[PDB]
């Protein structure tokens, strides 16, 4: 469960990302592909080069999903429902990998927004991303 303070923390970190949310998603993805190369097994159809248009566009889609999860953090299952159907019935990404993309999102935010990324904020963001991950694998079985 995300506490009321977690929610405030998450709403204000993510509010500072703002119009760079695109840029940060593309960077988190690139970090994930270099650091955990078994995740590339899900993108055989993409150019995974640095600067790649496919990764840039997909990082924007992933970041806008999180922005909406943040706007609807008291009701995230309902808000992410379509996306969770998609991951469970078509993409079928093994659940172990949501932790991987979750860690590279935290690294990207630590690197770009350090004044914000205090120990209490780091803890609220880790809980929030673990919880997004849970909604997105809730329909797997």
């Amino acid at each position: 469960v995300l506490s009321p303070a977690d929610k405030t923390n998450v709403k204000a970190a993510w509010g500072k990302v703002g119009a760079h949310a695109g840029e940060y998603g593309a960077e988190a993805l690139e970090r994930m592909f270099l650091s955990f190369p078994t995740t590339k097994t899900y993108f055989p159809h993409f150019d995974l080069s640095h600067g790649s248009a496919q990764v840039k566009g997909h990082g924007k889609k992933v970041a806008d999903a999180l922005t909406n999860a943040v706007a609807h953090v008291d009701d995230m299952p309902n808000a992410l429902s379509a996306l969770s159907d998609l991951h469970a019935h078509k993409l079928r990404v093994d659940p172990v990998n949501f932790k991987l993309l979750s860690h590279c999102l935290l690294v990207t935010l630590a690197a770009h927004l350090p004044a914000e990324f205090t120990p209490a904020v780091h803890a609220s963001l880790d809980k929030f991303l673990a919880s997004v991950s849970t909604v997105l694998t809730s329909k797997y079985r």
Binding site: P37, T38, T39, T41, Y42, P44, A88, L91, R92, V93, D94, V96, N97, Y140, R141
Partner: protein, 146 residues
């Protein structure tokens, strides 16, 4: 990871009682039933809609025979699992794009299928030797992923 001489003997004697054809069909079907996202790799196999469909699919029973035949030849070379599974590591990565997590899932289903078949003969010590063996095979299949 390494096996004591006694874990090796253990492993080799149970395997001597295994029908590699039937146990391979059974392990792969259980993997598709218990972790249904693994079916993403097997759209050509046909009807995988329900557990009886999956457990009676001829193409799933034939792929299990093939997967467990390769494993069974791994067991002749427990010293050298990385050289034994090296061409196959390369194929799973380069041509099939299989996330190596699936190898660990399969390993655990096979331990359950061995339990189910041997019962009291599948003692806590024999299970511990097989857990080491399936992790070794999963690690050698993933070693050569880039």
């Amino acid at each position: 990871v390494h096996l004591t001489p006694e874990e090796k003997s253990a492993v080799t004697a149970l395997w001597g009682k295994v029908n590699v054809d039937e146990v391979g069909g059974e392990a792969l079907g259980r993997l598709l039933v218990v972790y249904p996202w693994t079916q993403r790799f097997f759209e050509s196999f046909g009807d995988l809609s329900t557990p009886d469909a999956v457990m009676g699919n001829p193409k799933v029973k034939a792929h299990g025979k093939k997967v467990l035949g390769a494993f069974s030849d791994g067991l002749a070379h427990l010293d050298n699992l990385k050289g034994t599974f090296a061409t196959l590591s390369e194929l799973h990565c380069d041509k099939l794009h299989v996330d190596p997590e699936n190898f660990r899932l399969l390993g655990n289903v096979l331990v359950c299928v061995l339990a189910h078949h041997f019962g009291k003969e599948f003692t806590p010590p024999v299970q511990a030797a097989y857990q080491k063996v399936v992790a070794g095979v999963a690690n050698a299949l993933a070693h050569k992923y880039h």
